Symmetry: C2
């Protein structure tokens, strides 16, 4: 993880990435707070904070005494991918546009770069 | 400006932007350290550092006791645009790729996105 930004935000994005890539499928059981903290060498508090954010946004559910589960709702997962990809893309087009590069040339750049 | 990342590098990027868009045209006289510090409301020592980096990379030059100027070398300014665009594009492709989105679908995203 990147030294400068807060770790919990990077944990949220790490879990988001596991979801969007289908590492976890809808309904799958996630690692416990302690299991993930250990795996990543991160404070359990930080993991609990990231898990709290994921639950508030209806991505994951806590089953008291058993663990945390990925949403069963495939639409919610689709919405997560869409939201993340749309923001990355908007930001990219914004930054390219600030340099004067038109959409056709933006597309050219994306095609070119491996 | 973002107080998470060095300020002089953000000023370098701001100037680079004015350069790549032709707001400053090749050979043009630039604002003085003082003029720019006021316009951006930043510490002049930050502008000095940004101007130093621009001079080291041959983007600007100094005519002592007249001012600072943008390079008149068009290829240099083309190379600046290429460098910035390449990095932006590599970073974007990397982040999208990490999500499991393939190149074709990255292209489709770029084409469909409502530009804000």
């Amino acid at each position: 993880f990147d030294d400068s930004k807060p770790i919990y935000k990077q944990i949220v994005h790490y879990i988001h990435t596991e979801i969007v890539t289908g590492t976890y499928e809808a309904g799958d059981k996630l690692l416990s707070v302690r299991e993930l903290a250990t795996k990543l060498e991160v404070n359990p508090t930080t993991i609990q904070r990231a898990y709290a954010e994921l639950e508030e946004t209806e991505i994951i559910y806590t089953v008291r005494g058993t663990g945390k589960y990925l949403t069963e709702d495939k639409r919610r997962i689709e919405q997560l991918e869409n939201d993340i990809a749309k923001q990355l893309t908007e930001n990219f087009i914004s930054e390219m546009s600030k340099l004067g590069i038109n959409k056709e040339k933006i597309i050219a750049w994306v095609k070119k770069v491996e």
